[PDB]
Amino acid sequence: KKAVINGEQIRSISDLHQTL
Description:
little secondary structure, protein binding, Barstar, low pH, 160 kD, aggregate
């Protein structure tokens, strides 16, 4: 029971309101 997913992107810039 697994679903496929296509679409990669590391546009995670500015962690102002985020955290690594």
